[PDB]
Amino acid sequence: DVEITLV
Amino acid sequence: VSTGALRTITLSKMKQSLGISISGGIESKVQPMVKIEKIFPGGAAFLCGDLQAGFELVAVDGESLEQVTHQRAVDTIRRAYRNKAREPMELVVRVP
Ligand SMILES: [Zn+2]
Ligand SMILES: [Zn+2]
Fold first, then answer.
1. CA B27–ligand 1 middle distance (angstroms)
2. H-type helices in B1-96, by residue range?
3. Three-state SS for B65?
4. Are B61 and B77 in contact (CB under 8 A)?
5. Which residues of chain B approach chain A closer than 8 Å at the C-beta?
6. Is A1 within 8 Å of B22 when comparing Cβ atoms?
7. Nearest-angstrom CA–CA distance, B6 and A3
8. CB atoms near residue B41 (< 10 Å)
9. Where are the domains of chain B?
10. How far apart are CA B83 and CA B63, in angstroms?
11. Which residue ranges does the record assign to the PDZ domain (chain B)?
């Protein structure tokens, strides 16, 4: 359940 | 350095891209904490020799990222990096 987003 | 030591790192907002991916957030059972997932070429963070993937984000420009959702973390860092008047950006982190 780990979210990863390019900031 | 001890595990999880606190470190304050400054980062210029001059580059248009921060150039980092972040991971985690309080909804996550596996990674409750926000960490830098990857540092990308071209961005501001690739140029800071004290920033590494795997660091835990604690605060940005005085705004706590402790126990925040992934969405709030993304929003908070974006707003800080786009606030060019406040230079440089201040990131409080916990090293592995
Ligand atoms: Zn959710
Ligand atoms: Zn944290």
1. 6
2. 70-82
3. coil
4. no
5. 18, 20-25, 27-31, 37, 40, 70, 74, 77-78, 81
6. no
7. 24
8. 8
9. 1-96
10. 13
11. 8-80
Which tokens belong to B2? 């001890």
**Alpha-carbon distance A2 to nearest alpha carbon in chain B (angstroms):** 5
Q: How was this structure determined?
A: X-ray
Scan for tokens 């470190």, then name that residue. B7
Residue type at A5? T
Overall residue count recorded for chain A in this entry = 7
Structure tokens given for B16: 């248009």
Q: Which residues contact B27 (CB under 8 A, 6 or more apart)?
A: A1, A3, B69, B70
What's the CA gap between B92 and B64, in Å, rounded? Answer: 9
φ/ψ bin of B27: left (φ > 0), alpha (ψ from -120 to 50), beta (otherwise): alpha
Give the resolution to one decimal, in Å. Answer: 2.0
